[PDB]
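User: Modeling request: complex.
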Amino acid sequence: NRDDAFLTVQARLGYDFSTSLIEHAGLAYMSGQIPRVEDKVQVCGKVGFDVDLSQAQLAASISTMRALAILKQHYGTLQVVEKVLQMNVFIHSTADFTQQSEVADGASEILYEILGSDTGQHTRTSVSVCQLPKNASVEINFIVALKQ
Amino acid sequence: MNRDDAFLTVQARLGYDFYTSLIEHAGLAYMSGQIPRVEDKVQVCGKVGFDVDLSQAQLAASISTMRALAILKQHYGTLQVVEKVLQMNVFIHSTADFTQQSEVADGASEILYEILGSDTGQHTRTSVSVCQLPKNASVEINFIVALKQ
Amino acid sequence: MNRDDAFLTVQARLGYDFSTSLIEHAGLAYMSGQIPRVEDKVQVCGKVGFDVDLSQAQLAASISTMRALAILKQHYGTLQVVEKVLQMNVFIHSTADFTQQSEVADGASEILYEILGSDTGQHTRTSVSVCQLPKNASVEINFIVALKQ
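Assistant: Request completed. Predicted assembly structure:
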């Protein structure tokens, strides 16, 4: 039950998640998500300056969890997810930070823990940008295949 | 209704004359990134938050959107082929202090809504700050657009 | 045209040994970003416009493209499966003065043309400068590729 894994992992993080999405031909295109928990943006700052690797991995986890919550609210259940085809990770960082892959692992492992080792497979790109909306540390967008 | 004439209006108000730029597959048009270039010259150059203020950046986002719409219109005759703008990626050449990427992307979004309507003009979007852009441009935007058959 | 043999010849000219990364859905292969890693080492590290000049940046873009083509060939046996490269996004680790993103991206585009032909190698493209890349790489490139099937 993916929805119950969702609840479990949100508790593990200590946060409570409760146009952003457009569907076409069985694919959901999702707007970029910063680490907002309808409170505000949780891990703001520049990775490698204000934000260390662990906090950036948490931020990526929150962005992914938010995307999953938007999916669930729109379709009722995370069972509709067939594959996360693409995940693009933009990291607000200094010019010396080289651990974009580890920040992105913060999001990928959320995918695995909620969707399984099969359905949680995804392509990904992970780059450093010089700034983000509202001084966020991470922004992530998705293309997700849906079951019909 | 008349998306082509709403386009003509925006072109007139801006005062400009609007690898492969566009490829279609399975009813989707993929569009190359567009910097704010009309004629041959790049219209709004510089770093947002330094050389380019918010209003100029919104104008740049508009010019890039206009370029993409013109490419669609040139390839299909009319903007009536547009069913939905599935995705718009906005890359903003800015300082390390600029945090108003959403307001910059609004320059593109508002054009989409005015020309196509609130239904067909719906789009997901990502808007991030980058370190530099081709030819020192201030904004670059690419699109995935669903087409009517 | 035999793309696998073109690939080998181009691999020889470049002097590197290219011999989840990929997911297919509805005839499209989505590919993860590729840094210029051949064997297990990143080949052209540094900041374009600082440590890395234009010619080396183009080489790095070539290596990333070659890596994606190799991933395609090993996953499907032959590059004959490629119908079109729908989209190529090029991220360039550069200084704030570098404005030749198009010329770097030409490094990737030309590999596609040499190996896939002027028809199948056509692609849309986006090319922006970023502040850093995994493992201090100079270029990173992702792809969306349509397949024949």
